[PDB]
Amino acid sequence: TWRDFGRKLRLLSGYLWPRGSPALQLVVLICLGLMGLERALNVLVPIFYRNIVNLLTEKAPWNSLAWTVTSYVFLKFLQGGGTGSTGFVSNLRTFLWIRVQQFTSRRVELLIFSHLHELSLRWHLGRRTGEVLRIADRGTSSVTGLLSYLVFNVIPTLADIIIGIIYFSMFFNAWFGLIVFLCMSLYLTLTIVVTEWRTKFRRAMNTQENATRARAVDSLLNFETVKYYNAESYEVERYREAIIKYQGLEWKSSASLVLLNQTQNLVIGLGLLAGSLLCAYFVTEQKLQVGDYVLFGTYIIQLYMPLNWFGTYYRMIQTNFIDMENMFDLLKEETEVKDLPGAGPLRFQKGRIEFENVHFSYADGRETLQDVSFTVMPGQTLALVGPSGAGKSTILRLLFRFYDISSGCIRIDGQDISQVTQASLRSHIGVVPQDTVLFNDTIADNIRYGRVTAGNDEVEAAAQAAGIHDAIMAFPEGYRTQVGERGLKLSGGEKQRVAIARTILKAPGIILLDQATSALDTSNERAIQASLAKVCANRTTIVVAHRLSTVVNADQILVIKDGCIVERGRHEALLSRGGVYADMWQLQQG
Amino acid sequence: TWRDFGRKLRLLSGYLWPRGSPALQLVVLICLGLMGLERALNVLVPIFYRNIVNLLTEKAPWNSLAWTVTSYVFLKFLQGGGTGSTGFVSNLRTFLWIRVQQFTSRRVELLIFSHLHELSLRWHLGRRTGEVLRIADRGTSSVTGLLSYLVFNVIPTLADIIIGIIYFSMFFNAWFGLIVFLCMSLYLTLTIVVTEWRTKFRRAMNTQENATRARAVDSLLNFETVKYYNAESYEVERYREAIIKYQGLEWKSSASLVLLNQTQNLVIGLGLLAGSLLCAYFVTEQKLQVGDYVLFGTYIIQLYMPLNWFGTYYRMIQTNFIDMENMFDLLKEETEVKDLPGAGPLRFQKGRIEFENVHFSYADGRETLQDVSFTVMPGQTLALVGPSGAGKSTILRLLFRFYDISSGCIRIDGQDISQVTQASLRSHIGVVPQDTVLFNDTIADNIRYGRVTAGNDEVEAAAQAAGIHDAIMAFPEGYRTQVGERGLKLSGGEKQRVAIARTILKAPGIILLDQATSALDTSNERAIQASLAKVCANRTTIVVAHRLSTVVNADQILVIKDGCIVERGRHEALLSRGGVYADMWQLQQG
Ligand SMILES: Nc1ncnc2c1ncn2[C@@H]1O[C@H](COP(=O)(O)OP(=O)(O)OP(=O)(O)O)[C@@H](O)[C@H]1O
Numbered sequence A, B: 001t002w003r004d005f006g007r008k009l010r011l012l013s014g015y016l017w018p019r020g021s022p023a024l025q026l027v028v029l030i031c032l033g034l035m036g037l038e039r040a041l042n043v044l045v046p047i048f049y050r051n052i053v054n055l056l057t058e059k060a061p062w063n064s065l066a067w068t069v070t071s072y073v074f075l076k077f078l079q080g081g082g083t084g085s086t087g088f089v090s091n092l093r094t095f096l097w098i099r100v101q102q103f104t105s106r107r108v109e110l111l112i113f114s115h116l117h118e119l120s121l122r123w124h125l126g127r128r129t130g131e132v133l134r135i136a137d138r139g140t141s142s143v144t145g146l147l148s149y150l151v152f153n154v155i156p157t158l159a160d161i162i163i164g165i166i167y168f169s170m171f172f173n174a175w176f177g178l179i180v181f182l183c184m185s186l187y188l189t190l191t192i193v194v195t196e197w198r199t200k201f202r203r204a205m206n207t208q209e210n211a212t213r214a215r216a217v218d219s220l221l222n223f224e225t226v227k228y229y230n231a232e233s234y235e236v237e238r239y240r241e242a243i244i245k246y247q248g249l250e251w252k253s254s255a256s257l258v259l260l261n262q263t264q265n266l267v268i269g270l271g272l273l274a275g276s277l278l279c280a281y282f283v284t285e286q287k288l289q290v291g292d293y294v295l296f297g298t299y300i301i302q303l304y305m306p307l308n309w310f311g312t313y314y315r316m317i318q319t320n321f322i323d324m325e326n327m328f329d330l331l332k333e334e335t336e337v338k339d340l341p342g343a344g345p346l347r348f349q350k351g352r353i354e355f356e357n358v359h360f361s362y363a364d365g366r367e368t369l370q371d372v373s374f375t376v377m378p379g380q381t382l383a384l385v386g387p388s389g390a391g392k393s394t395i396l397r398l399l400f401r402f403y404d405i406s407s408g409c410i411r412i413d414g415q416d417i418s419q420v421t422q423a424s425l426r427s428h429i430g431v432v433p434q435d436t437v438l439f440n441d442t443i444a445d446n447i448r449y450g451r452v453t454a455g456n457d458e459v460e461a462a463a464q465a466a467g468i469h470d471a472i473m474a475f476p477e478g479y480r481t482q483v484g485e486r487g488l489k490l491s492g493g494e495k496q497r498v499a500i501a502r503t504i505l506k507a508p509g510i511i512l513l514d515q516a517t518s519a520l521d522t523s524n525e526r527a528i529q530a531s532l533a534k535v536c537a538n539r540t541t542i543v544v545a546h547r548l549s550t551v552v553n554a555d556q557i558l559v560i561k562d563g564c565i566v567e568r569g570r571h572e573a574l575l576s577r578g579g580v581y582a583d584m585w586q587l588q589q590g
C-alpha cells in the first residue's frame, strides 16, 4: 500500500496541467517563474541582513547606510515571511492561479457528475444518498486542495532546503551543509516511521465515519415515516450513541497527530542546537565573524519556518485524502450494461416486439423470469396480469434495457436490442413508472421534460389528454406552480396524471404502462383510456394493471404467476377456458 | 449589518465554554494558562537572542557562552515560530483542546439534528434535500472551525501586539511604541474599509451558490426519470452552463482577496521601513547599541509573522461564515404546529372521532375543506370516496395533526386534539401512508419500527396478517434482506404489505388507511381485509379507497367532491337514493 501511494500522487498530478487551452498553458509557465523567483529571495534576504549589521559595526556614513536598509525592506516586502505565506510575489501568483484551478475544479466536477448518470440501474438502487452526494460535493475540493499544497507548499519547501544545502557548502564550509542535511534526513525518516504507525488509526476511521451518518441521513430522506410513528426521540438517541463511538475513535486519530507534531519539533530543535553551538564555536575560535552568526541565525529560522506552519494542516491533509480516495474508488466502477463497440442505431420501422425464451436473475439465487416468450404485432395492446411479485414490471425493465439478460433474445423489428446502441433504443420507447417521481420545479417543466424542445402550446394540448388540464386552472399561479421535492405537494392522483402527460409529449413508438390507474378513481380511467386509444391507434402498447376491467378490450392477455406464463390469449378465450384467469375474474365480480 | 455582526461573534462565543461538566471546565482554565505562557516566550526569545550576540561582541569565554546559547534553543523549542504555528507548548494545548471541541461538535450536531425533526410537515415538503443535508453537514465544522481561529489565532495575535506596545515603550523609548501602534492602527482601518467594499461580491455569491447545485442534486435524487427519457446529456449541459455563471462570479470574490492581501502587505512593509530606518539612525547617532538593532530586527518579524500566515486563510474564513450563517438562519425557524403550555396527555378511552364544521386551507388561496362534519362511533369503519384531488387524504392529515385548522373543532373521545400534547395524540393513531417509504436496512427492522421493543416472534406473527409472510421465505437471506433506499429493491406490492405490517405491530386505538390495496391485486385484498377485520374488531377505522368493492360492508360511506360532503350513509341507502354515489357505482359495473 506504500507503492500504490506513489501512483496516488502521480494520478493526482495529471490534474495540474491544463489540456487543450494554450491560453492557460502559459499562465502555468510563468507561475513557475514567480515560484523560481521567490527561491532567490530566500537567499538574498538574509545576505542583505548581515550587510546592514556589518555597516553598523564598521560605522558607515548615513548616506551610504540608508540605501541598503531600504534595500532590505524592499526584498522583505517581496518575500512576506517565507514560502507558504503571502508576500507580494507569493500572492501575485495566487492572483493568476485562481483562473487555472477554475479549469481543474470545473473539469473534475463535470467528470464525477457525468459518471454518476452513466452508471447502470443496479448501482443506483444499492447506493446511499448521504454517501454519494457527499463524495460528489467534497470531491472537487480535495483535488483542488491537495494541488494547492503539493505545488505551493511541499515542493517549494523541498526546493528551499536543497538550495540551503548548496548554500552553506560552497560559501561557508563543509560543516553547515552537513548539519542542515543530517537534520532534514532525520526529519524525513521520523515522519515516515510515525506515519506507518499512524495508519492503524486513520484507515479504521473512514470505514466508521460513513457508518455513523448513514442512519441519520436515512432518517431524514423519509421525514414522514419518522413523523407518523411516535419518534423524533428514538432517532436522536441512536445518533448520540453512534457519535460517541466515532468521537471516541477520532480522539485516537487527532491525538496521534500531536505525537507526530512533537517528534518533528524535537528534530528541528536538535539541528538548531547543533548548528547554533557550532557557529558560536567558530566565532570564539575566530574562524568566522560575528556578522556571519547573524546570517546563520536568521536563515535557519526561515528554513525551519514552513516546516512548523505545515504542522497546522495535518488534520485537513487527512480529510483531503479521505475525500479524494473515496472519489477514485467511485470512478473505477464500470457500467454494468455496456453497448457494443461498432454499434449502429436502432432502425425503428413498425414496432414488433418479440421475446424468445428469455431467462433472467437479479442476484443468481432465484430465476425471476423463466422461459418468457411472446410476440406483439404492431398496433396492438398486450396485457400482463398476475399477483404481486410475479415479474410483471421486470419485463418492462428488460425491454427498456436497464439489465442484461442471461440467455434468450429480445427483438424489436427483427433487431436485437443488445446489438444496437442503448441511447437509440430508449428513444422509441416511452414508459410511465409505477410510482412516479417529479423534479423540484414548475409542473409545466415536468410535463415538457419528455420532449424538451416543445412549446407551451403543445404542453397544454397533451395535458388535455391526461385529464389534468381542468384541474390546474383551478390552482393559483397557473402552470408554473410548485410540486415540492418529488411531487409531494400535489396529490396521489395529480402526481400521476403528470406522468401520463409527459409520455405523450415524447410520442414514442412503443408505449409502456407499469401503473397508470392506481391512484385514479373509476371515472378517470376511461377519460384517459379512450383518450390514449386515439394516441395508441397505430403504436405498440404494453399495459399491466391489477384491476381487470381495463384489459377487457386488449388484444392479448398474458398471465404471470411466478415468472412463468401459465396461459395466454384474448379475454373471451380465457373465460371459457376456466383457468386461473377465469377464477381471477369471478373473484372480483363477487 | 455591521452592528449585527457584533452578535454573530457574541453568539458564537457561547459555544466556547463547556456547560454542566466541570471536568472539562478546568481544561479550558489551563489551556488559558498555556496560552498566557506562550505570550511570555514571545518576549523572552529575542531578548536571549541579543544576549548571544553581545557575548560574541564582547568575546565571552566558551564556558559561559554555551550555557546561554542552549538557553536560546530551548525557548525556541517551546515557541516553534510564533503563535499560530506548532511549538512544544502550542501543540500541548492542542492535545488538550481536542477533548473540548468534541463536546462542542457533539452538542451542536445533536442540536441541528433534533431541530430538523421537530419542524412541522409544511417545511419538509418545501425544502430541498441538497441544501438541507449540506448545512447539517457543514454546520458543525464552521463553529468548530471559527472557534479554533478566534481563540487560537485572532486573540493571541492581538494579545501579542499589545504586549509589543508596552514593550518598546518602557524599555527603549517613546518612539517604537508609536511606530508599531501607528502601523497596526493603519492595518485595522484598511482591513475594514476593504471588507466593506468586498461585501458587494461575497453576499451575491451565497444566493447563487445554492442555485447552481439545486438542479444537479435534484437531477440525482430521482435517477430513474433521467434514465427513462433520453437524457444524461441534457442534465450535464445545464450543469456546465450553471457552473460558468458561478465560476465567473467567484473569480470576482477570490481575486478580491488578493487586493485585500496586497493592501495589508503594503502596510506591514511601511511600518518595517519606518522602524528599520529609525533604529539605524539611533545607532548612527549612538543612542543605542548594534546589539539593540538585532533585538529589533528579530522581534518585528515575529510580530508581523502571524499577520501574513493568516492571509492564507481568508477563503476558508469566508466559507466558514457562509456555512455558519445558513445554520443560524435555519435555527430561527419555529415549529408551525405548537402544543399549548400546560398541556396534558390525551386520555384515550373508546375512540370516538368527531369533526364540527372544520375549515382548512393550505396557502389561503383556496379553501380545501369546507364544512366537513361527521361522527364515528367506536368500533365502526368509515369510508371516504370521491374523485382525485377532493380532499380525502387531507382529512387524514388533520386527524393526525400535521396541520392546524382555521376554524371548527376536532374531538377524540370528547377531547380537543389542539389542547392535548401532540406526542400523545399520535400514539393512539396508526396510519399507513399512500405511497410507502422504507428505511435503507433490513425488512425485519422496517416491520418492527412500529413498536421497537417487540421481539422477533411478534414481528413474524403480525407479518402473517399482512400476507407477506409466505413471500419472504421464498427470498434468500430470510427476514434481514435489503430493500435498498426507500424500498425500491422489493416491488410495488411487496413494498406496500410491509407498511400494513408495521401498523399492526403498533396496534393503535385508531387505524387510518390512505391507500392499502392500490398495488395489490384483487386476490390479496380480502386475504388482508378479512385479516384486518379481526384486528379492527373493536378499534376505530377510517378507510379511503378508489376501488369501490372494498367499502361495501362499511358502516358509513362519505362522498367528497371538492372538499364538501354531498351525501352520506350506508351502501344500500345511497344506491336507492340515486345520487352521485349510485352513478359512480353503475359506472364501474359496466
Ligand atoms: N431491484 C431488485 N433487486 C432484487 N430483487 C428484485 C428487484 N426488483 C424486483 N425484485 C424481485 O423480483 C420479483 C418481481 O417483482 P416485480 O418488481 O416484478 O413486481 P411485479 O411482478 O411487477 O408486481 P407488482 O408490480 O404488483 O409489484 C419480486 O418478488 C422481487 O423480490
Ligand SMILES: Nc1ncnc2c1ncn2[C@@H]1O[C@H](COP(=O)(O)OP(=O)(O)OP(=O)(O)O)[C@@H](O)[C@H]1O
Residues within 6 Å of the ligand: A488, A489, A490, A491, A492, A493, A494, A519, A520, B125, B362, B363, B368, B387, B388, B389, B390, B391, B392, B393, B394, B395
Ligand atoms: N402539501 C400541499 N400543498 C399545497 N396544496 C396541496 C398539498 N397537498 C394537497 N394539496 C391540494 O389539496 C387538494 C387535495 O389533495 P389530496 O392530497 O387530498 O388528494 P385526495 O383528495 O386525497 O385524492 P387522492 O388521494 O386520490 O390524491 C389537491 O387538489 C391539492 O392541489
Ligand SMILES: [Mg+2]
Residues within 6 Å of the ligand: A392, A393, A434, A514, B491, B492
Ligand atoms: Mg410494478
Ligand SMILES: [Mg+2]
Residues within 6 Å of the ligand: A491, A492, B392, B393, B434, B514
Ligand atoms: Mg391520497
